[PDB]
Amino acid sequence: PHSHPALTPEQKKELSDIAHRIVAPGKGILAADESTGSIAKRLQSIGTENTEENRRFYRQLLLTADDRVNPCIGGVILFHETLYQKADDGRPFPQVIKSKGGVVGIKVDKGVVPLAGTNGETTTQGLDGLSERCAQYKKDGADFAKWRCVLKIGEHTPSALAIMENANVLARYASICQQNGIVPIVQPEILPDGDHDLKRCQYVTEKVLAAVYKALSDHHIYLEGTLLKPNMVTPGHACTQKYSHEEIAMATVTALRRTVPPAVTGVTFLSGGQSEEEASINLNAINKCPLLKPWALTFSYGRALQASALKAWGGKKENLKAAQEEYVKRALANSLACQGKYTPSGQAGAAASESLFISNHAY
Amino acid sequence: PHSHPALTPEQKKELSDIAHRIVAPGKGILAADESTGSIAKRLQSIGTENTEENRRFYRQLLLTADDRVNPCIGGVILFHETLYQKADDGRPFPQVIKSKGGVVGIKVDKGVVPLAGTNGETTTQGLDGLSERCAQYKKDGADFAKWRCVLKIGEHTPSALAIMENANVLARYASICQQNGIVPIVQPEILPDGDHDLKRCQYVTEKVLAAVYKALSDHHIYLEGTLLKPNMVTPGHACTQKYSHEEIAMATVTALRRTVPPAVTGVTFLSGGQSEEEASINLNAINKCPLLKPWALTFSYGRALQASALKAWGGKKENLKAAQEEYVKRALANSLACQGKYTPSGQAGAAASESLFISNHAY
Amino acid sequence: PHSHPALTPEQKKELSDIAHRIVAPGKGILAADESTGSIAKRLQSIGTENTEENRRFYRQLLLTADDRVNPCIGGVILFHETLYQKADDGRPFPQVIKSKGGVVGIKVDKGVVPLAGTNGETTTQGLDGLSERCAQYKKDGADFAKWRCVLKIGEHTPSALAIMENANVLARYASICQQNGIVPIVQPEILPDGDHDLKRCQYVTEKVLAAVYKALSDHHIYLEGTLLKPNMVTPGHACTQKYSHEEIAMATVTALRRTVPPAVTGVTFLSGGQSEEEASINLNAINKCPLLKPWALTFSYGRALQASALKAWGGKKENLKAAQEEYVKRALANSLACQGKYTPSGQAGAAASESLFISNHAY
Amino acid sequence: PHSHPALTPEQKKELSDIAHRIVAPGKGILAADESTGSIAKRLQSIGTENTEENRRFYRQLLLTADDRVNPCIGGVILFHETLYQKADDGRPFPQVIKSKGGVVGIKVDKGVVPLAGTNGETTTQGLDGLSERCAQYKKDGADFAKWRCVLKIGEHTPSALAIMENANVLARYASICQQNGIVPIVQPEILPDGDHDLKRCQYVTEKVLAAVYKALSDHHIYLEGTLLKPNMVTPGHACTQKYSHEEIAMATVTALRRTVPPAVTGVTFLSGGQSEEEASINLNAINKCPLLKPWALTFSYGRALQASALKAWGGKKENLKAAQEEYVKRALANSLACQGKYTPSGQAGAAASESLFISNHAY
């Protein structure tokens, strides 16, 4: 082959520094990049009207939490709208985040689209004008981008086409980001839907990650200047078998060790519909695995850090401090979990809200 | 594998019918899809200002060609602007085209962007919202589309990356079109730049087309519902070895036979910076090549069809008829070219001219 | 990519000449390259002993069928052993084939081996020292070779690995043959085993063929100096669905039209467990198909040419002429069929049962 | 996709155990697997005529080294012949190796052959019947195997065909080995020949290694049951720029971190023409590199351990005592280097006993 370096030693350093700040020991990411529609769903759930001020207010609640959260929050992913909003104090949101020590992030993909000739499989769009948008994003304080691709497990899925196409689009996305001084989060999300077991998800996860990394190589991506946002290796939600958190940990860590080169700065896990406490325990178990993990493994949770806070809010202005507190709490818990210092680990008799698929009711 | 019907019998018939209609014996394609920036160039070089009206009247000037052109033009590629323009008679352009018996085409790509880490190589964007766009274009009279990818020959180009990426993006575009009833014209354009010889161009052409058709296969593309708009196999514009028309025909056809499968309805050739006459002589030669050609070998020219017409016009509404006459003659000339029934009134056709590269000034 | 001529003009011409001779109009291939274990089975079924002497006689009988066979046989695929045996007059078997106007071929693969981590899939060995074997084989009268690869349709097969691998091994084999002056017959054989219907077989046939030609292109294979020996697109042997011959014909032609480039000199179909009649009938139908077929569509039958001749001989030298006329009959019949001239023969004792049950009735 | 366990957890256990035993901290591999041809070269140099007895005695000299080498040698690669030879005490070589705590390895490839249509590139053969040989080798005491694949850097090398094919063959060999309980050493050898600089060598290695691991994944290879035998990152033997061992180590470690998954048990570097001292200094530099290294970084030296021992021997039995001491010292010197605890007694000594390899008069 022949080389024509995409980045200079100076470009690589900036990307590497940013990537390292976000996942520094004890820190994770707050995913509060819910689209106007997604957020509308949540706000509706807690009986609050999906209004402009309301959205700007709920984001304030999170980004304006007391200094207690600072060493826990390394990065915050915002939606295009939020990025251009102001706080009560006047300060534009990206500033509030930076003053507290966090790196500003922005979701740039434009949704998933169906791939013809498959069984409900998709790919993601958003590459058009990405360079210009990323250029403008870096200008407006943003440093890391988010892009979501989704894969499904089934009898004939994920197919080779979905694996190939999704891997390629991720590499294209990452390439443009790196050119604009923006560290790209690679997010090949494998859906926990179905009744497949643990090994299956682990096999599929390994296959997927393998393709992903080879594509990044083809597109000449500076891996140090990237972060991996994968799904935890877990059994399907409908799976009848039960698994210990330590099994989940072992599955996940092993899968990553067989595919993710040590050059990748970090792995920020998705909650994948797990409960707040469950997400912590699993994360802690992961960091507690006796296997050599050369990358940082932390969190990139949305609902798993907001659930209780959203409820505590309920759209009530007076519940401000109280709701923020629930978030500060989830914050600390996860700061300890990414360090394997989060005590809550050995618990199951009253920790899993999925015993229905274990009961005779599933047979 | 396992089948998952990308299209129904009905959908396939429509694509095939449209496709076949475009390249019927004696018919070619007029490429009038120059974007605002490219059309400016033309009007600028002749001497008329880049006015919207000047562009509408100009394009009218082509599409209003008397019935003589009817059996010649099977399709016309339009740019978005032109699509919603009306002729002086009040009738919208797509309808005018149709009343003459031609099929309306629409360019859908958004230009080429750079592939980081390459030697000036690019890919093409346009996929975002392309599905909804095609559906709108179809309701509006468009039955086929055009997407231009470009590849270059150089000491280290085209590389594996550019080849894979361009063929992949093309397959994507082809899938989105076929879903919406629009026949996709696949354009893997290899530039004639450089001092490379005929054999080099033939070689890379073969490696490009091969990757392309493997790509269409993976994406489950309906070949019968597509068309290939490639470059003729010729030597580089700065090459020293002079070749006969027969030599370029034989090289072109052999490369196609080695890569393009029989199911592809037709091959619409690009001019490639060739003079109006050169294009007709070459095309004619390819059709006169003794080798078996199972697909249509016709044209999809732009400059080769409107060079003189544009000139004759000179922006003056009074130059109208003569300008139009130039076009008809190039339409007729080529109509016979794609049938191997054409002959320039020379002896062994028109000769070759000022090629400083095939002279003492190239050493 | 970057060229590096694998063959000189003369080498290409040699290969092309040979390939074209084998598939001249009205001609096909006699596949009599049964391995020691294969011919043993057929011999034992009729009670005849499996000795080199018995084999030499059986092969002798076929190889010297009356001159009426000359125009029907373009080539004969022999097993190693036979290439070195002589006819009763002391003349080397290949020379007996050459004398009759036929081309000599040799089996070169070393059989299929299990693929790990698959559902009983395989690949084919035989590469080691193949270039040396081919140089010698060429010296000894062989002009074309045969390499068999087996793919099986199942709920999840052929897998991406089996397809990729089998295509790669074929391309390596072909390359070696072409470097030693021998025409390689690409045999991507999909088994009729299973209860999959026609549609399923066509889809699988199309996916596998695309991969094959991409690999051949990747390994710089000269298509004109190759022959493709595939399966006709038919329903699985266990399929309950009844299909007419015209459907079988349309499916097979459609699949080839969509994947086999026109530069391929010819397609030599194998019988695939069909009866002698079925083989002639389906191939005739194939040559009747109203679609454009740029390549010679012929036969490469083993059982479809011998089954009846084997029942005439029955191990007794007395039945020499009886056996020979049977095969002469089947050759003449397929010669018509490969030209779409075969008149399907009426009830001739068969049409209830063919020849090889195992035997006829013994207690 | 869908899994089909190529190995049972127990087989996986055994493979993992072997791989770990080989590269235990402070241990490395002695590559004494020279073919009859290669060794004859070394013997000629010391006026020793290549004979069955001489070879057997030189191997015995090396293998009978005093017990200090035991904690240095985790394994020894042998050639077929040697596996069945016995030391003067009546016990077969494999038994002795094991007596000294070492694991026995065998070279299984059948050498390289040229790839058609490339700039003199090659691929490796040796797969035919490999499983049977593996079953035999295991029976006789071999626990791991060696397969050499050669890659060359130049103006247009390695080519995609060369990367693709070699990576694929390596994977096929690995699959076969693991099925027989033999730990396969993946050896994608990039030649130091040429005048390319450090940057190019590092860039090429990364691309090759990425391709290799993608192939291993595709073929379902158990990484924990394999080892990697790569070249160190160094400029070509014809390069004129001066590089320090620190730059060498940095380039080397970096490339590995970017491509080799943490699951790979160990990495055994090969001599690469380097002098004995150069090898130890470089291996040590590598271990002293401040970058995170998840896998064991050791050696698999042949000439970098035998050089002075052969010379010392000089074909004189008296020099037996002498020769053995030279070996033990290099081994002890490398046991330390693979632990980053080695130090040169001032200068080195390369140009004095050889003048180096590449291109003095190269064959």
Is residue A174 within 8 A of residue A167, CB to CB? The reply is no
B 197-226 near C (Cβ less than 8 A): 199-200, 203-204, 206-207, 210-211, 213-214, 217-218, 223
Subunits adjacent to chain C (3 or more Cβ pairs under 8 Å):
B, D
Q: Can you read off the two tokens belonging to residue D81?
A: 């012949």
Interface contact A199-D292, CB threshold 8 A: no
* Residue-range definition of the domain harbouring residue D239: 1-363
Subunits adjacent to chain B (3 or more Cβ pairs under 8 Å):
A, C
Q: Which of D214, D262, D294 sits opposite A214 (nearest CB)?
A: D214
Is residue B224 within 8 A of residue C255, CB to CB? The reply is no
Is residue D212 within 8 A of residue D226, CB to CB? The reply is no
Alpha-helical (H) ranges within chain D are 9-22, 36-45, 52-63, 80-83, 93-99, 130-139, 160-179, 198-218, 245-259, 276-288, 303-313, 319-337, 350-353
Among B38, B105, B97, residue whose Cα is nearest residue B303: B38
Q: Can you read off the two tokens belonging to residue D274?
A: 């380097």
Query: Smallest CA–CA separation between B182 and chain A, in Å?
Result: 15
Q: How far is CA B11 from the centre of its chain?
A: 25
Distance, CA of A111 to CA of A34 (rounded, Å):
12
Report the alpha-carbon angle B253-B257-B263, nearest 5: 120
Q: Can you read off the two tokens belonging to residue D183?
A: 């730990």
Query: Smallest CA–CA separation between D302 and chain C, in Å?
Result: 26
Q: Which residues contact D145 (CB under 8 A, 6 or more apart)?
A: D105, D106, D107, D108, D134, D137, D173, D177, D182, D183, D184, D185
Among C10, C21, C7, C17, residue whose Cα is nearest residue C222: C7
CATH code where residue A129 lies = 3.20.20.70
Q: Which of C2, C4, C127 sits opposite D125 (nearest CB)?
A: C127
Query: Smallest CA–CA separation between C4 and chain D, in Å?
Result: 5
What is residue D91's three-state secondary structure?
Answer: coil
> Considering only CB atoms, which chain C residues are within 8 Å of B218?
210
How many of the other CB atoms lie within 10 Å of CB of C229? Answer: 22
* Chain D residue whose CA is closest to C120: D4
> Considering only CB atoms, which chain C residues are within 8 Å of D5?
117
Q: Which of A200, A214, A262 sits opposite D292 (nearest CB)?
A: A262
Is residue D34 within 8 A of residue D79, CB to CB? The reply is yes
Distance, CA of A204 to CA of B218 (rounded, Å):
20
Is residue B241 within 8 A of residue B363, CB to CB? The reply is no
Interface contact A294-D262, CB threshold 8 A: yes
* C126 CB within 8 Å of a chain D CB: yes
Interface contact D207-A217, CB threshold 8 A: yes
How many of the other CB atoms lie within 10 Å of CB of D1? Answer: 22
* A290 CB within 8 Å of a chain D CB: no
Resolution (A): 2.0
Is residue A273 within 8 A of residue A232, CB to CB? The reply is no
Query: Smallest CA–CA separation between D99 and chain A, in Å?
Result: 32
Distance, CA of B303 to CA of B280 (rounded, Å):
12
Which secondary-structure segment (H or E) carries A334?
A: helix A320-337
* Residues in a beta bridge with D228: D186, D267
How were these coordinates obtained? Answer: X-ray
Q: How many CB pairs under 8 A join A and D?
A: 69
> Considering only CB atoms, which chain D residues are within 8 Å of C222?
none
* B8 CB within 8 Å of a chain A CB: no
Distance, CA of D22 to CA of A120 (rounded, Å):
48
Q: How far is CA B54 from the centre of its chain?
A: 24
- Exposure class string for D285-297: b at 16+ Cβ within 10 A, else e: bbbbbeeebbbbb
* Residue D166 half-sphere exposure toward CB, CA atoms < 13 A: 31
The residue with tokens 């161009």 is: B201
* B139 CB within 8 Å of a chain A CB: no
Q: Which of D214, D233, D256 to mutate to test the interface with A (most CBs of A within 10 A)?
A: D214
Q: Which of C213, C218, C226, C228 to mutate to test the interface with B (most CBs of B within 10 A)?
A: C213
Return the DSSP state at D153: -
* D4 CB within 8 Å of a chain C CB: yes
Distance, CA of D217 to CA of A170 (rounded, Å):
20
Interface contact B117-A176, CB threshold 8 A: no
Instruction: Dump the DSSP string for B276-330.
Output: HHHHHHHHHHHHT-SS---SEEEEEESHHHHHHHHHHHTT-GGGHHHHHHHHHHH
Distance, CA of C147 to CA of C108 (rounded, Å):
6
Is residue C73 within 8 A of residue C31, CB to CB? The reply is no
Distance, CA of A215 to CA of A169 (rounded, Å):
9
Which secondary-structure segment (H or E) carries A103?
A: strand A103-107
Is residue A277 within 8 A of residue A351, CB to CB? The reply is yes
How far apart, in Å, are the Cα atoms of C73 and each of C28, C342, D324?
Answer: 5, 16, 69
> Considering only CB atoms, which chain D residues are within 8 Å of C184?
none
Interface contact C203-B158, CB threshold 8 A: no
Distance, CA of A320 to CA of A61 (rounded, Å):
7
Subunits adjacent to chain A (3 or more Cβ pairs under 8 Å):
B, D
* B35 CB within 8 Å of a chain C CB: no
Domain count, chain D: 1
Interface contact A213-D210, CB threshold 8 A: yes
Work out whether the CA dihedral C30, C36, C38, C42 comes out positive or negative: positive
The residue with tokens 């179809």 is: B138
> Considering only CB atoms, which chain C residues are within 8 Å of B261?
257-262
Burial of C290 (0-12, 13-18, 19+ CB in 10 A): exposed
Among A349, A284, A303, residue whose Cα is nearest residue A46: A303
Interface contact C175-D128, CB threshold 8 A: no
Interface contact B260-C262, CB threshold 8 A: yes
Strand residues in chain C grouped as ranges (E): 28-31, 73-78, 103-107, 112-114, 122-124, 144-151, 183-190, 227-228, 266-269, 296-301
A 146-185 near D (Cβ less than 8 A): 155, 158, 160
Q: Which of A3, A6, A113 sits opposite B131 (nearest CB)?
A: A113
Interface contact D116-C6, CB threshold 8 A: yes
* B12 CB within 8 Å of a chain A CB: no
How many of the other CB atoms lie within 10 Å of CB of C358? Answer: 8
Distance, CA of D225 to CA of A352 (rounded, Å):
36
* B20 CB within 8 Å of a chain C CB: no
Q: Can you read off the two tokens belonging to residue B256?
A: 């196609």
* A260 CB within 8 Å of a chain D CB: yes
Query: Smallest CA–CA separation between D195 and chain A, in Å?
Result: 14
Is residue D302 within 8 A of residue D34, CB to CB? The reply is yes
* Chain B residue whose CA is closest to C157: B1
Interface contact B1-C223, CB threshold 8 A: no
* B115 CB within 8 Å of a chain A CB: yes
Is residue C171 within 8 A of residue C218, CB to CB? The reply is yes
Q: Which of D223, D258, D261 sits opposite A223 (nearest CB)?
A: D258
* D5 CB within 8 Å of a chain C CB: yes
- Exposure class string for A270-279: b at 16+ Cβ within 10 A, else e: bbbebbbbbb
Q: Which of C117, C125, C219 sits opposite D161 (nearest CB)?
A: C219
Q: Which of B127, B164, B180, B222 to mutate to test the interface with A (most CBs of A within 10 A)?
A: B127
Q: Which residues contact D363 (CB under 8 A, 6 or more apart)?
A: none
> Considering only CB atoms, which chain C residues are within 8 Å of D6?
116-117
Among A113, A91, A108, residue whose Cα is nearest residue A100: A91
Distance, CA of D130 to CA of D109 (rounded, Å):
9
Interface contact C204-B254, CB threshold 8 A: no
* Chain B residue whose CA is closest to A132: B113
Is residue B15 within 8 A of residue B181, CB to CB? The reply is yes
Q: Can you read off the two tokens belonging to residue B249?
A: 């025909």
* Cα first-last separation, chain A: 57
